[PDB]
Every structure is written in C-alpha cells, then in structure tokens.
C-alpha cells in the first residue's frame, strides 16, 4: 500500500549538527553499538583495542586490548556488565566490565565457528546471540560457553543481525539479498523476505516490533513488516550509486537513519519516502549508525576514526 | 569538573597508553597472504622465529613483521577484504608446477587460470589500488621437473617457445605482472622459493621497505 501514506503532512527538511567529536582512535571503526542507559557507547578499533566511550563528558574509561587484532563488530550488554567482540578468528570474546580487583577481565572466549563474527548482540546478561560468517547466526551462552540453538536457512553468508524489544524474535539479513525472521524460542525461520537485488549490509528493527528496514548495496532501502509479508515503502535516490551499510531507527520510528558510502548519512521519512536531511561531515564512509533508545544521540562510526553524535 | 577530574585524568592516561600501543603497532608492518590450496605456505611460515585466520609476528633486523595467513575462510572474499584498509602490501603465494594439474572443483579450469582470476580480482578492486603485491613462487624444482616432462602447450595454447626453464620463468614473470591496470602504484616483487635457498626473508624485507618508502613519498607528493 502506497496511497494511504501520501495523505500525512510532511515533516519537512530537518537539519541537525554534531554534538561531540570522539577523537582518539587511530584505526578504522566498523561497529559502534550503543548502550541502554543512553550514556555509554562501545567502539571497536582496528589495531588492537576496544574502547567504551562516554557520550556526555566524552572521556574514555576502558580501552581494552584484544588477542585478535581485527575486530569486525561489537555489542554492549543491556545491563552494562559485559561486551562482545567480533573479528575473523572466530573468537567472540566476552569481557567482564564490572569486575573485582581490576579494570576489565575477559570472561569466556566463544569458539566453534568457521566463518567470521560479523554482528554480535545481547538478549540478556547470559543468553547472547551472534552472527558468524559461515551462515551460522547461532545463539550462545556465557556460563557454559557453548551454543544452544543454531539457525540455518540462508543460501549465502550472513553479515547483519538485529533484535526485538520482546527479545523473543529477531530478524537478520544475509548477503543473498534475503532477511530471515528467526525465533529464539523454536529456533526456526518464521519467514524470509524477498524483493531486493543487492546484498543486505546491515539491518535495523522497528521500536514496536512489527517492522524493520534492510540495508541493501543497491542504493535502496525497504520497510518490510512482520505480519504483512510484503514491502510497504521503498527509498531510492538517483544521484547516488553506492549502497547503505547501516540502518537504524529513532525512538519513534519515523526518522530512518541510513548510512551510505558517500562519506555521509541520510535521514529518511518512513511515511513520506523522501530524504529529510543529509548528515555530512565524515572524511570516509560510515560503517555503523547507533541511535539511542530515546532518540537522544545518533552516533556514526565512519572509517576515519571519528564518532560524531548528530543530535 | 570538580569530581570528574579523576575521570578525565584516567581518560588521559588510557589515551596515552592507547597512543603508545598504536605507535608500537605501526612499528610492526602488516602483511596478508593469499593463494590457492597448499601453494607453499608451510615452507615460508616454518623458517621464521615467530577456523579463523592465523596471525604471527616475528622480528628481523630490528623490524617486526606481522604475517596474516587467511588460509581457510568459509565466508566469501568480498567481505573480509572489503574491510582490510590500511595495509602496506600483500603476498601472493603460487606454485609454477600447478599448470598441468586441474583443481578438484570444476574439472574444467586450470589452477593457473584460477590463480590469474584471483590476481585480476584482487588487483581490480577499489581497496588494493595503492597496495603492492609480492609474488612467492614455491617449489621451483617441481616446476623445472614438470617443464622438462611437459611442454606447457596444453596449459597455454597461445604460448610458443622452446623447452627449458629460464624462458618459462621469464614468461611467468611477465604473465602475472600485466593483469593490473597500472604499474606506477601497483608495483610487484616476484621471488622464487624451494627446499634450497634458505633465509628468503631478505627479499620480503627489501620489498616492504621499498613499498613503505613509496607510500611515504606519495603521502607528501614526492613520488
């Protein structure tokens, strides 16, 4: 349906500037996941380090080294006690933040995959979920350090994962131009969505838990629901050729924060299907867009070692 | 700023520590390895002092080399290479004796054809335009035996020449050094390797010094 969404009054052109200039990184940034308290964020460097930055005071607290030099992604626990790290060595290390007699100590090393950890997420303190590069976005535990559920059904490899506030379901897009909605309870795939040509770089999730948006490398975004089984809205641009590499939603869901490879980002409207604002100011292409739970900050993780909060 | 002073001091301390770690890491040059299956990897990683990728580090002539052997990667090359910006050079290990054999994947393409396709793929990407390639040629004695037993006319139909080893090695030196679009920013250093001729680290040392010098000159426009 595209006729009922044309009667809403347009929000207009919105322009937002940077707030903090998180300087200190000397390598590339691939994933900067945001916490739940809307205050701390985690940033994955590329040389050897993983820094949990602060947003208000803009002062680092833990810049912990890693056994793996390459860190593909990162995840911050909803409780703020553990962090998950990606990489290519198939070691999703879980560092303990709030530890006794020390700053930060590693708890368990998650091994048993053959691809590469592309996008880790945390359902709760213990039950966590990863997304490897060998088409195994299996679920993990911290106490035993072994998998409990394995998700299969993607032809190619998967490189994106997003959770739900209900924590019971989660959608994840693979490089075969398909996003599958897995269920944590049964472990099977509810539905695989089709309609995009290029691979799904990164995927987001709607705040209510009834829709999502996928990031395709074909300069096209889509708003796919969970109970409609059909693409509702699409966002395409003519004067660009690169594709989105990270999509995120705000606290309301109208502002779709998309990140292209034009060394900038964009804010789409989920109802008017028009580019509201262009967020420029990055020397390199953006790699991740982290929006808070209350829409208080929109951080970007471009490869220029600069994290800019556009709020 | 009253009670947060300790927080800012700890932030500055860990920032100095991170800067020291980054300066120490930049002192260690990073190299990746590519090639076909069993193309002479053990012969070069066992002479140094030293699922997922392998990362080794060894010191030679007051210089730290960080070798990254991808080896077996279940995921596609388009992903982990796409996120490998900031490397000085790459290494391409091949065996010239793998021209009369056919890989057990399609039974229709030659191993040299697959190596040339991999080279054209890694040389025509938007991430390795300013990155150099060092070609390692493993088991040159096996290649000599094969070229003394096989005339090479079955692998390359357009090739024409006599039956020897020097001109074949020269043709190989001119076969993998022309697939790139330009040679000013895509310099290639080829070297042979076999059971003999130990301590071949001097070649890769000279190559990495040359490529980092050329990079530093291109930074300031001196090249």
């Amino acid at each position, epitope marked *: 349906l595209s006729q009922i969404t044309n009667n809403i009054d347009p929000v207009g052109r919105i322009q937002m500037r940077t707030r903090r200039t998180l300087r200190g990184h000397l390598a590339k940034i691939y994933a900067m996941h945001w916490g739940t308290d809307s205050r701390l964020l985690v940033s994955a460097s590329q040389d050897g380090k993983l820094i949990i930055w602060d947003s208000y005071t803009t002062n680092k607290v833990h810049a912990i080294p890693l056994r793996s030099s390459w860190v593909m992604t990162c995840a911050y626990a909803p409780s*703020g006690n553990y962090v998950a790290c990606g990489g290519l060595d198939n070691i999703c290390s879980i560092y303990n933040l709030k530890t006794r007699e020390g700053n930060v100590r590693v708890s368990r090393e998650l091994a048993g995959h053959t691809g590469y950890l592309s996008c880790c997420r945390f359902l709760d303190d213990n039950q966590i979920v990863t997304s490897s590069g060998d088409t195994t976005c299996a679920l993990w535990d911290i106490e035993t350090g072994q998998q409990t559920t394995t998700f299969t059904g993607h032809t190619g490899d998967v490189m994106s994962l997003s959770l739900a506030p209900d924590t019971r379901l989660f959608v994840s897009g693979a490089c075969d131009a398909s996003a599958k909605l897995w269920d944590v309870r049964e472990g099977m795939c509810r539905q695989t969505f089709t309609g995009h040509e290029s691979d799904i770089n990164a995927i987001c999730f709607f705040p209510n838990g009834n829709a999502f948006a996928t990031g395709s490398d074909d300069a096209t975004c889509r708003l796919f629901d969970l109970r409609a089984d059909q693409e509702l809205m699409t966002y395409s641009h003519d004067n660009i050729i690169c594709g989105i590499t990270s999509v995120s939603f705000s606290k309301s869901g109208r502002l779709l924060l998309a990140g292209y490879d034009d060394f900038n980002c964009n804010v789409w409207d989920a109802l008017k299907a028009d580019r509201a604002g262009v967020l420029a100011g990055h020397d390199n292409r953006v790699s991740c867009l982290g929006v808070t739970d209350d829409g208080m900050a929109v951080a970007t993780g471009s490869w220029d070692s600069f994290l800019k909060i556009w709020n | 700023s009253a*009670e947060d*002073k300790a927080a800012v*001091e700890r932030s500055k*301390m860990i920032d100095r520590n991170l800067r020291e770690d980054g300066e120490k890491a930049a002192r260690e040059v990073k190299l990746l390895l590519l090639g076909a299956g069993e193309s002479g990897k053990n012969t070069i990683v066992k002479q140094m002092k030293i699922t997922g990728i392998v990362e080794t580090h060894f010191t030679f002539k007051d210089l730290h080399f960080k070798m990254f052997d991808v080896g077996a990667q279940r995921s596609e090359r388009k992903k982990w290479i796409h996120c490998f910006e900031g490397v000085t050079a790459i290494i391409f290990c091949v065996a010239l004796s793998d021209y009369d054999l056919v890989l057990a994947e399609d039974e229709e393409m030659n191993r040299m054809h697959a190596s040339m396709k991999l080279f054209d793929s890694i040389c025509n990407n938007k991430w390795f335009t300013d990155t150099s390639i060092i070609l390692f040629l493993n088991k040159k004695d096996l290649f000599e035996e094969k070229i003394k037993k096989s005339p090479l006319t079955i692998c390359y139909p357009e090739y024409a020449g006599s039956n020897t080893y020097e001109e074949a090695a020269a043709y190989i030196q001119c076969q993998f050094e022309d697939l790139n679009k330009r040679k000013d920013t895509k310099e290639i250093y080829t070297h042979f390797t076999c059971s003999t001729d130990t301590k071949n680290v001097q070649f890769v040392f000279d190559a990495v010094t040359d490529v980092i010098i050329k990079n530093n000159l291109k930074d300031c426009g001196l090249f």
Partner: single-chain antibody
Amino acid sequence: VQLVESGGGLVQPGGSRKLSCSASGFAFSSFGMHWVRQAPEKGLEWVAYISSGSGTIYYADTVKGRFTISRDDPKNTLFLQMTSLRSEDTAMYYCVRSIYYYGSSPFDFWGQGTTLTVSSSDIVMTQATSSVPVTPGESVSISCRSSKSLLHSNGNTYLYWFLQRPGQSPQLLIYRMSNLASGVPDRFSGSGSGTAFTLTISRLEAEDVGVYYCMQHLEYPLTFGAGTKLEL
C-alpha cells in the same frame, strides 16, 4: 586483592620509620590510593591521594608541605616518609584503593592497616546523632545533614556511606547514595534532597553493630565527621 601493612611499633616524636602497604591481585597501575587514617577517639580523616598511574597529587590543609608519598608500579609498593611527627597522630592508617569513572564504585575495598602509639576552602560537615539504641529488625531510617548543596552540574549527588565492623575492614555500603555497591544486600535505600540525606534499612540482619560514616567527593578535602554509632 589483599592489602597488608607492616612497619608499626613505638616511635618517638620527630624520629624516622618506613611504612608500606603491600597489595597484589589487581591492576595497581590503574587504581588511585588513599591514606585515610582512623583514630581510636577521632573519626576518619583523609590526608593524601595519588591519581591512577602516578598522576596528580591531592593533600589536606594541615599537611601540605609536611608529608611526602611515592608509588612504585614495577615494585607495586607505596613509599611513605613520616617526618616531624607530633604526639597527637595515634590513628589506624589504611591503604584503600579507588577508581573513578561513569558508574564506578570508589572506595570499594579497604585495607587492614597497622597500629602505632607515641609518648608525650575547607569543607566541613556535621552529623545528626551520636549513639542511639537501635533494635535489629525495625527498618531503621538514619538521617544526615550537610553544609552545601549536592547539586553538581553533572546531575548526581556525591555521598558515600561506610561502616566499620569490630575487627573488620571499613567496607563500602552504598555509593552515590542511590546505587548499591558490591558485597551488600538489597536492603539499603538512600534518598534525600541536595542538603539533607536519608537511608532506610529494612529487614536487618545480625552483626549490625558497626558505626555509620558519610563522605563527600565534591572537593579535595575529605571529612568523615564524628560518627553515628548504633547499639543493640
């Protein structure tokens, strides 16, 4: 993990001795240390503080220019030089660690310390009570006042609570007056305005005979006060 002190005994006013606090089991290079002493008749008083990693120095008003403290991370020790000693310094010196960041738990673990005997701008805060009989299991509500408004620009108060059990180190009870620390049950509830503070304790347990002390970290001077003791 451990904090063991040694070098005590009988000293003369104006002499010289070497005191250290040996600690091992944590990152000593990323933890600031204090030297809060405890007199048998006077409440605790902070004297000196070093930042994490031999950084800044913090002193008191009556000690600036008299004492000198150094640290050694490779040796993991604390070098203290006690010169110009007076006859009124009988106290229990501690070697307490602390770390300060967003959501940190400062003054989490306190040392043991050794005793010693001898022969013959500033922020001050008063208390409410001195020693009242409290029965175990009555949901005790302890109150406290201050001489300043805890309305810092960051948006949170700075009030830490401590208790010294007989023969047990003065461990931490609650930090920032609204967030429970590690090692305490889920029974303490701290609240109040910027001037006055209150702390409710429901479902009390045994061995609750320690004295309560308060601490503010708005400025360099750290004053604990007299002390509100609890009876049986």
